[PDB]
Amino acid sequence: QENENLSKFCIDMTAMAREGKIDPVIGREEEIRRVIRILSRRTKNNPVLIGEPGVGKTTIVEGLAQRIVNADVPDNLAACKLLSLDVGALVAGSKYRGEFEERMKGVLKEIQESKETIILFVDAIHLLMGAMDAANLLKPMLARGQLHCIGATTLAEYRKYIEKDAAFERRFQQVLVKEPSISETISILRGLKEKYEVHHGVNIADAAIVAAANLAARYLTSRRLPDSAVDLIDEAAAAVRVARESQPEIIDSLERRLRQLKIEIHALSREKDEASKARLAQAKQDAQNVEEELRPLREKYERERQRGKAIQEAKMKLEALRVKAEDASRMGDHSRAADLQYYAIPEQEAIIKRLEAEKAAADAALNANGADVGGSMITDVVGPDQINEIVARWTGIPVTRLKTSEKHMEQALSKIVVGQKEAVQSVSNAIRLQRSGLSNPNQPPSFLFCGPSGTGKTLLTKALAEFLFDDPKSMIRFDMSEYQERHSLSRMIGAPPGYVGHDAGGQLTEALRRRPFSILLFDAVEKAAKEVLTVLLQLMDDTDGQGRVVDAKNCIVVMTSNDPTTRELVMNTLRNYFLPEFLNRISSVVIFNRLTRREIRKIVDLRIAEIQKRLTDNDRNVIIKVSEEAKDKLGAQGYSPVYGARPLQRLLEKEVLNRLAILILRGQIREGEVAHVELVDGKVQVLP
Amino acid sequence: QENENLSKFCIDMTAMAREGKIDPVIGREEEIRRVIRILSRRTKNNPVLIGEPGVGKTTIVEGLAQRIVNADVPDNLAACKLLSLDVGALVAGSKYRGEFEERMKGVLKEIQESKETIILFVDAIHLLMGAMDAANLLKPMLARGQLHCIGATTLAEYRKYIEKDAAFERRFQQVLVKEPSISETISILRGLKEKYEVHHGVNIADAAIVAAANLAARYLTSRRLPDSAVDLIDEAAAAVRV
Amino acid sequence: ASRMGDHSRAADLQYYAIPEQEAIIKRLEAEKAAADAALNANGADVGGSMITDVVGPDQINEIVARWTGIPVTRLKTSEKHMEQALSKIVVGQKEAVQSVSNAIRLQRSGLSNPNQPPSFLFCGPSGTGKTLLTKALAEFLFDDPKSMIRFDMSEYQERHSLSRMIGAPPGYVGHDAGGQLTEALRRRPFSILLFDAVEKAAKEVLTVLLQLMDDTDGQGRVVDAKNCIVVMTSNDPTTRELVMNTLRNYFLPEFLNRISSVVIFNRLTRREIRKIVDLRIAEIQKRLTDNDRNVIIKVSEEAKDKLGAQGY
Ligand SMILES: Nc1ncnc2c1ncn2[C@@H]1O[C@H](COP(=O)(O)OP(=O)(O)O)[C@@H](O)[C@H]1O
Ligand SMILES: Nc1ncnc2c1ncn2[C@@H]1O[C@H](COP(=O)(O)OP(=O)(O)O)[C@@H](O)[C@H]1O
Ligand SMILES: Nc1ncnc2c1ncn2[C@@H]1O[C@H](COP(=O)(O)OP(=O)(O)O)[C@@H](O)[C@H]1O
Ligand SMILES: Nc1ncnc2c1ncn2[C@@H]1O[C@H](COP(=O)(O)OP(=O)(O)O)[C@@H](O)[C@H]1O
């Protein structure tokens, strides 16, 4: 009937469903079959697909309505119309008081009168009320009008605006969908590689995608897997188009000098002082040979390029095949079903002919490609490597860990963190239990990092954060004495049993998920009212079928506390603090070392080799030299058990550095002059 | 074909590109090359250039087609037409209910029917949905009409109106282009010193620009560095003429 | 000629074409001798110049000098040290100015440039100079005095009103709620930052201060940044230790070390107060000498001794 407020403000997700524009969502059979039976309840009969942006909670309804027009839907409301009310178009609606609800009330009778057997997907459903956007119109219409709809927005906004009254939850039961794994994406990414390779015109052999979605495993969870794998893979298909088709520069820059000198012979045939004749012969015959050489490739390669446009069309040809039979039987009108399909699908097989030649043609221009220094013609063959650069270019340092594990941690952790001989070892020895798969228990890799009040407890947390996962933003650093006792300790909210992040603010509750592959740390052992201390226990070592609740977390955890003798002292002074059960249920409790000479001396090398980086990374190049005589003033002042080793940096500035750049601005040490610093009384410089 | 709804409301950038009126964009090879590959995606295939006012994010669309009309572009949609849709040009003459969308409705089929391989960089693209300027016509168009466009508005206008729903992000991924520094300006003012010495009739030895772009370093970073510096330098080359 | 593929006029036009370039050097030989020799002829008596086509480091300087600020003072400084100005303008805080001077030269010089900006815990008596040192240096570490956004932390005392001030959330920058910080991170690039009441921190802004001072989109679809110099304020090392431990009742011990040097302000004495008495009459002569009339002002110590003690 009328489709106006439908059509101009919402799009039918059954249009591309009967048609086939929308990419065929393959798996997800868990949520698809359910929402059918949810939308068929008496109570809680409007499913809400709450989840992250990319999990497929629009793809869910995209594959939901797909198989509704084709085959599978109960003859109770089968092969009907589902329209996606995209409210982003009503967000920016006309101007005055309301002027959105009056346009909304138009959608209402449209759906109430024009064939009531109609479903509605709605994107970012919370905004219709919570926002100015008011959706007060549900109360009779969800009862009297009996509309059928599916929401799609993160439950974080379900916890905000979808629980206002009884009509809110009693009419919408929430359908949880959170994240597919590296093996769940690849499985669902197997079926949608069909649609995403053709819009680009590329053929990947196998290993770009496994390199892709498993690189999308740990890094671009910032924009997590199911829409970052397809974002990433679009670029890997989009990488080669500008590569194979751009007629490689090895050819294109070669011909600009040729036409420079060759076409010059044309007009140079006019009578001038005949110092021109020599340039004719020199530009005729030196440019005549090079003519013969570029003539084969720029055609026979562009003949391979000719097959490329021919095959992309040769494939997009087959697109019309599947859309025909689906509608041939959709209405049950086989008057055109059989007669149209018989002719030839082997347009598929009428095209290998182009492939037989081109296959020998991709690498034979490479076969011909070698005469001098080594240029590379990238053709359509994007591979395990071809994806690695996109990670390398966009996300982080170039391919170092990508190609390391594809085709041991101790030496790296210790050439960066010099102390704690067995501690790094014990951490490494306990970390290989979890990430390898040897034994996977309920608890994450828990550590009670206890040591002297400073010099390395959180420091070992940084060195492994780069190597148990990658990012340094995956550490939320805190001190337990920021929220000393019960009240301010109850302010920090990590994971309440029923609600996660409802009302009160914590850097933990949803920040559990803000850093998935991450470390966690809190530094003040003595600040615990022994209830947060225990809800820690039931979250480390210890969900909705229809219970209507959610909670989870998994990462690595290292608890911090500001020759086993003093251990038992701590163990029993931690008996004066903790429960005996607690001290065994985390892990082998691990201990940090004190400050000595040999460890302090190499960190002096680590702060002058660092001060050389911030010297070498800028413009000027000034060479730095320091002997033991100046070193022994700060070396003893450096290891400071009463405060820590952070005073190394403070008095490095207050003693070392401020007497350094002064001589650059005074004129004693220039950029080519060497700076020596000796200590007799006040550690002054010299240049002997 | 017909150029009315195009020409009287928008300017085809790629005109001067063939000619050389548009000043040659020098560096920025990072942002120029990508939007090609962005506009070639399946998902997030319409670049939105969020950045600061003057640093050079229309040169980017100017140097894109430049090295496209001269030499370099894959044979997939090469040396085609990009037009600068100035929505300020749709403001005049539109008074009644709409009177803008009907002038939009003219731009739509003009680009969908007359040689579909056509891109449009659009200035302050946020205004077409954010502003009574409405670009609600996307929903069939970015899907059925499959247009090729590049937005330009400071991320303040992306954070306002370019995040309404998924079609905003799933079709527009934002291309950050922020600011070429004093040695990047000298680098970007290196390549654009050719064009700016003749319109004024001046010969600078070296030290006007390094003193200027490094004096606009700290003071006229107010409005921005490379376009208060290339403004400033137009004052210093225009200084001598009088 | 090659833009389509028809080279019917490509070469024929270019062959005899290019020599115009070399036709303009003949003219140049003369004109070069003509630009500054007309300058050579200009001198017989006093008072006059020739300005020719030669726009230069100076020729731009006036545009800076005329347009942007006071005339050419800092432009020609480096062309052919901070204490005397800072101290002849801000008379107290002997080592504080120095310690500020000693810690500021780490960043803007390039000797060592860490993730954190030149952070300062500007702490001193609750008044008489806390924000005062901030103005004199802002004019010399960068240029504008509008590059100072002043606020008070007890204007937004505790958590809720503290959550109103939005400085830099992890994903969105300045999206919905109003704060004088989020995009004001970018409003003042060459700038100072300061807030005076540390104790109004619920220890979440304090650490997102820390995690933003001490620490963006490849494909993550997110943005955040800020960088300037920062000076943090709090309303014979004895009482220092008191602070360092009374700051334990407030801050985290880690926090008190991640700011490079904690720096201290001095009290009010006679010699520091008496030169500021001279600095308010040397200004009152400026606002006397800057207008039309000329009235000379003289006051003895006896009148000064009423307000001198009432002054500090
Ligand atoms: N069953 C499925 N089969 C194939 N692809 C799927 C499936 N479910 C989800 N997807 C993927 O989800 C992506 C789109 O995510 P989207 O629908 O925007 O998520 P959401 O609706 O949660 O924001 C597509 O790139 C598609 O590859
Ligand atoms: N193993 C180590 N190697 C080098 N430097 C260290 C080491 N442990 C601590 N530091 C120094 O300690 C400072 C930070 O103190 P930290 O050890 O992080 O205290 P906490 O771990 O209690 O937060 C850093 O500046 C760093 O130079
Ligand atoms: N890659 C580049 N090539 C040439 N000029 C540039 C480049 N980047 C910045 N510029 C400078 O920025 C100036 C104007 O920037 P424009 O491109 O008009 O920016 P916006 O629209 O952000 O205001 C140009 O005149 C040029 O002087
Ligand atoms: N070293 C100084 N030199 C000059 N004036 C000073 C100095 N210290 C304090 N003052 C005086 O302090 C007043 C400003 O107080 P201020 O210290 O800025 O308060 P707050 O730091 O709480 O903002 C000015 O009127 C000025 O006369």
Numbering used by the authors:
A (entry chain A): 173 to 303, 311 to 586, 591 to 725, 729 to 748, 766 to 891
B (entry chain B): 173 to 303, 311 to 421
C (entry chain B): 507 to 586, 591 to 725, 729 to 748, 766 to 842
Task: Give the published text.
HSP100 unfoldases, a subclass of the AAA chaperones found in yeast and bacteria as well as in the mitochondria and chloroplasts of higher eukaryotes, employ a powerful mechanism to recover functional proteins from aggregates. Upon forming a hexameric ring, they unravel polypeptides by threading them through a narrow central pore. To avoid damage to native proteins, the high unfolding potential of Hsp104 and related disaggregases needs to be carefully regulated. This control is mediated by an inserted coiled-coil domain (M-domain, MD), which assembles a molecular belt encircling the hexameric particle and keeping the enzyme in its latent state. The Hsp104 disaggregase is composed of tandemly linked structural modules that build up the N-terminal domain (NTD), the two ATPase engines (AAA1, AAA2), and the regulatory MD extension.
Here, we present the crystal structure of Hsp104 from Chaetomium thermophilum that – although forming a helical filament – reveals important mechanistic features. The crystal structure of the double Walker-B mutant in complex with ADP was determined at 3.7 Å resolution. In the crystal, CtHsp104 subunits are arranged in a helical 61 filament rather than forming a defined hexameric particle as observed in the recent cryo-electron microscopy structure of ScHsp104 or the crystal structure of a related HSP100 unfoldase, ClpC. Although the obtained crystals are formed by the full-length protein (data not shown), the NTD was not defined by electron density, likely due to high flexibility. The active sites, located at the AAA subdomain interface, are defined by co-crystallized ADP molecules, which were clearly visible in the electron density map. Importantly, however, the crystallized filament seems to reflect mechanistic properties of the HSP100 hexamer, as the architecture of the basic building blocks of AAA unfoldases, the so-called rigid bodies, is comparable to that in both ClpC and ScHsp104 hexameric structures. The present crystal structure provides a detailed picture of the resting state of Hsp104, shedding light on the regulatory role of the MD. In parallel, the MD binds to the neighboring ATPase module by docking the tip of motif-2, particularly Arg509, into a two-helix cleft on the edge of the AAA1 large subdomain. Strikingly, in the crystal structure of Hsp104, the PS1-hairpin protrudes from the AAA2 into the AAA1* ring, where it is accommodated in a deep pocket close to the ATP binding site of a neighboring subunit. At the tip of the PS1-haripin, the side chains of Gln732 and Arg734 form specific interactions with Asp406* and Asp410* located on the sensor-2 helix.
